[PDB]
C-alpha cells in the first residue's frame, strides 16, 4: 500500500526521552519524499549507507521521532556516554541504524513547537539501604524508567523528581533530574531509523 508518515507531521513532537515510534510493515516508502519536507542537516547511518536506506527492502522498519536540538548533535552517538545515550535514547547495535537531524521549515506548519528542549541528565535509583545509588542506564529500543516521574516537558533546568518505591517494587527511591535547552526559531528534530530482516516478510520496499 503506502507507509503512512502522517503521525510524524501532525502535532507536537515528544521530547527525546518520551520518543514516539512508527513501526512499518507491508508498505511502500519513499524516504526522499519525506526528507524533502524537512531541512535535513545531518544524515549518519551505521552498518548501512544513507543511499541504501532509501532504496532497499527490509522485513520491518522502525522510525523513532522526537524533538532534538541540533546543538547537542554530538550526544546522539551510541558510543558517547552523555546524559542522552545514558538516560534518554539509545539505538541498537545488532541491526542497521540511521540517524537524521532535521529542521522544520517555515512552510511546514502542522508541527507545533514546545516551550523548550528537555532531557533527563540523571536517572538513578536509591536502594532500601538509603546509601547505595544505582544509575538506571537506558537500554536500546526501550524507555527510561524515570519517565514515570519526569514530566513531558521539564519546567526548569535543574528540577529534580522523586518517587518512593513500594517494597514489592524493590523499596527505596526512584530519583531523576532534568535539564533544558532553549527553543530554536525553527523546531529542530531527530529521527532514528532501524531496519530488521525476517524469513519471508521482506515487505517494506521502496515504491515505483
Amino acid at each position: 500500500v503506502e507507509c503512512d508518515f502522517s503521525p510524524l507531521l501532525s502535532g507536537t513532537p515528544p521530547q527525546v526521552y518520551n520518543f514516539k515510534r512508527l513501526v512499518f510493515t507491508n508498505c511502500n516508502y519513499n524516504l526522499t519524499k519525506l526528507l524533502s519536507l524537512f531541512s535535513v542537516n545531518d544524515f549518519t547511518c551505521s552498518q548501512i549507507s544513507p543511499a541504501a536506506i532509501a532504496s532497499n527492502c527490509y522485513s520491518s522498519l522502525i522510525l523513532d521521532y522526537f524533538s532534538y536540538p541540533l546543538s547537542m548533535k554530538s550526544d546522539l552517538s551510541v558510543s558517547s556516554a552523555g546524559p542522552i545515550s545514558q538516560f534518554n535514547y539509545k539505538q541498537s547495535f545488532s541491526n542497521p541504524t540511521c540517524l537524521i537531524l532535521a529542521t522544520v521549515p517555515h512552510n511546514l506548519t502542522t508541527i507545533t513547537k514546545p516551550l523548550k528542549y528537555s532531557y533527563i541528565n540523571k536517572c538513578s535509583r536509591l536502594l532500601s539501604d538509603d546509601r547505595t545509588e544505582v544509575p538506571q542506564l537506558v537500554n536500546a529500543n526501550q524507555y527510561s524508567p524515570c519517565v514515570s516521574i519526569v514530566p513531558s516537558t521539564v519546567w526548569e533546568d535543574g528540577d529534580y523528581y522523586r518517587k518512593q518505591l513500594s517494597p514489592l517494587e524493590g523499596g527505596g527511591w526512584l530519583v531523576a533530574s532534568g535539564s533544558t535547552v532553549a527553543m530554536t526559531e525553527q523546531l529542530q528534530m531527530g529521527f532514528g531509523i532501524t531496519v530488521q530482516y525476517g524469513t519471508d516478510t521482506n515487505s517494506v520496499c521502496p515504491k515505483l
Partner: protein, 183 residues
C-alpha cells in the same frame, strides 16, 4: 564599588571598569582573573584591561541569586556571602544558584532619619520553621573557553534528592576534581 590599581604601571585602570553596586568580587587563586557578581549575575574578567563576560542572565532580586548566598545560607551555613569557588588553576569556576521565589519573606519597618516622612518597609526571604526553603544548584564554567559549552550543572547525589536539601561546602581537590558537601 571597586577600583583596580595596576602595579606594573603604578596607575589606576580607567577602561572596562567594575560597575558600581557590585555585590561580590574574588580574584583567581593564581594570576589576575576576576569574578564579580552584579545584579545577582556572575561576570568574569580574564584580565583587568579585558571586557567582562556575563555568565548567568536570570539574576532577579529576592528570586534568583547567582554566586552570592541568600540570607539563611549566609547566616547559618556559609558564614560568608560568597558562593564562588575558583579552580586552583583558575580554569574552572563553580558558582551556586539560589531560588527564593516561593520562600516567604519577613517584613519590618525602618524609621530612618527625621527627614523620612514615611517609614520604609524592608522585605527579606526568611524561611521560618517548616516554611519553603530556597533551592540551590551547583554549576561549573570553564573560564578559558567560556564561549561554548553553556554552564555544566553538577547534579546532587541521589541520596539527597529524596526531598529538600542544602549545599554545605565546595572544595577543590585537584585542578580537575571537585568535592561538594550535600545535606
Amino acid at each position: 564599588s571597586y577600583d583596580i590599581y595596576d602595579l606594573n604601571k603604578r596607575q589606576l585602570i580607567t577602561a572596562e571598569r567594575i560597575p558600581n553596586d557590585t555585590q561580590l568580587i574574588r580574584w583567581s587563586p593564581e594570576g589576575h582573573k576576576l569574578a564579580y557578581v552584579w545584579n545577582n549575575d556572575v561576570y568574569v574578567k580574564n584580565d583587568p584591561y579585558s571586557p567582562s563576560q556575563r555568565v548567568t542572565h536570570d539574576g532577579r532580586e529576592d528570586a534568583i541569586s547567582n554566586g552570592i548566598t541568600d540570607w539563611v545560607y549566609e547566616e547559618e551555613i556559609f558564614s560568608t556571602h560568597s558562593a564562588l569557588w575558583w579552580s586552583p588553576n583558575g580554569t574552572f569556576l563553580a558558582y551556586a544558584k539560589f531560588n527564593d521565589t516561593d520562600v516567604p519573606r519577613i517584613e519590618y519597618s525602618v524609621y530612618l532619619d527625621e527627614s523620612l516622612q514615611y517609614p520604609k518597609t524592608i522585605h527579606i526571604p526568611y524561611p521560618k520553621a517548616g516554611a519553603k526553603n530556597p533551592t540551590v544548584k551547583l554549576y561549573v564554567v570553564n573560564t578559558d573557553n567560556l564561549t561554548d559549552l553553556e554552564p555544566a550543572q553538577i547534579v546532587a547525589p541521589a541520596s539527597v534528592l529524596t526531598g529538600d536539601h542544602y549545599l554545605c561546602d565546595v572544595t577543590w581537590a585537584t585542578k580537575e576534581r571537585i568535592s561538594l558537601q550535600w545535606l
